[model samples]
Each structure stands twice: as C-alpha cells, then as structure tokens.
Target: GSSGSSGCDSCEKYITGRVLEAGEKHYHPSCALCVRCGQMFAEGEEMYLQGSSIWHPACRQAARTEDSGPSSG
Candidate 1:
C-alpha cells in the first residue's frame, strides 16, 4: 500500500527538490510570483494570497492605490 503525494501546486511538477509551502500547497521557488505585478518575491519577503493566487505586499499596495481610487469612502 502507498499514499499519493504531490509536487508543486502551481506548476504541477513532481517535487524532487526544494520547494515553498503556502496556502496548503507546495510550490517551486521559481513558481511563486506576485500575482499583481508578475514579479518574483525575495527570500523571506512577505507574501499574500488572493483566491489562491499569490501576491506581494508592494504589488498589492500598488494595486490598491490604482484600483481603490474610485471607491474611497
């Protein structure tokens, strides 16, 4: 008997090397990216999630500044 395991959730590649864990999923270091800006995160940098998508604080802040301008209350 055996248990099936997983690799990178984003790339869906078999995990045979180093990986990053986030939001109950494993991801390759290169697979993790800022969803808002399409940039990679620095090691140990803060990360955020948006409906299963990864995002960086700086990118989120940028997005907020641009997108929230019409909803200021």
Candidate 2:
C-alpha cells in the first residue's frame, strides 16, 4: 500500500506505486478494486486512483447514491 497524504483523509488504505507525472494518474492493475461497493471493476471503465487504491466510477456513484449512515433524525 502507498502512503497516505494529509489531503486524502477519506481513504482507508493507500494506493500502490508512485505518483504519476503532471496531468497523469497512476494505474495499478494489481490493486484495482471498487472502493465504494467493494466489487471488482470491469475492464474499460473510468477509474480513479487515490493513494495506492483504485475505485470504479460506478461504485463511486453507488456509494454516493446510498446513505452513508443512519440518518441523525
């Protein structure tokens, strides 16, 4: 796992490999997984790299659609 940055407070784990150059993002196949639904991402999907982890766009959307926790009310 990669080291966590102060900016990445939401990530529970770090991503793999070093950071990419400007205007580029690192893609590590070995650590590819949906951070939201915990499902494996399909090929040819938009993925986001944060820390040393990979997240599928769909999973991210699903995560957003679902309630993160019980409502305070």
Candidate 3:
C-alpha cells in the first residue's frame, strides 16, 4: 500500500515535493495564497491564519477594518 499521500487543497494535485502545512490543510508552495490579497508569499516569509483562511499580516490588518464590525447589533 502507498503511504505518504499528501494533496493540495487549492489545486487538487498531489504534493510530491515540498509542502506547506497550515490550519488543517496541506498546500504546495505554489498553491498557497493570501486570501485577502490573492497573492503568494515570498520565499522565507511568514504566514498568518484567520481560522482556516491564510493571510498576510498587512492584508489581515486591512481586512479587519472592514470586516470586524459587530454583526448582531
């Protein structure tokens, strides 16, 4: 039986090379993107997560201004 079966949730392809593990999903380096900006991370850069959505610090901060309103008011 084949072990080590890793797949990218973004592209639905098998990640046979290096992988980026975030939240509960595994991604290929090329498949990962910032949810707010729709851009990929630079090499050796850090990644941040909001629940399951991966985001850049700047993007997350920008997003908070617009999306952080209390909804139940």
Sequence-dependent TM-score of model 2: 0.31
Candidate lDDT scores, in order, read: 0.68, 0.45, 0.73
Give a tens-digit lDDT track for model 2, residues 1-73: 5555422123433444332221244333334345565664443555665444555665555555465557657
Cα lDDT tens digits, model 3, 1-73, are 6755548887777877777777677787877877777786654566677767788878787786675657747
> Any residue pairs clashing in model 3, and if so which?
none
Q: How many backbone clashes does candidate 2 have?
A: 5
Clashing pairs in 1: none
Worst 10 residues of 2 by lDDT: 19-28
Q: In candidate 1, residue 7 scores what lDDT?
A: 81
* Evaluation by TM-score, superior candidate among 2 and 3: 3
Q: State model 2's lDDT.
A: 0.45
Instruction: Sort all candidates by TM-score, best to worst.
Output: 3, 1, 2
Report the lDDT tens digits of candidate 1 across residue range 1-73.
4545568887787667767666677777788776677675544555766657776767776765454445548
List TM-score per model, in order: 0.61, 0.31, 0.65
Q: Which candidate is the best by lDDT?
A: 3
Q: What is the lDDT of residue 37 in candidate 1?
A: 72
